[PDB]
């Protein structure tokens, strides 16, 4: 559930 909003989005799926 872990997202960052940057380039690239890094999203973790927790």
């Known amino acids: ?3 960052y ?3 690239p989005p890094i999203c ?3």
Do not use: M
């Open 5 to 7: 909003k940057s380039k």
């Open 12 to 14: 973790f799926p927790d």
């Open 1 to 3: 559930g872990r997202c």
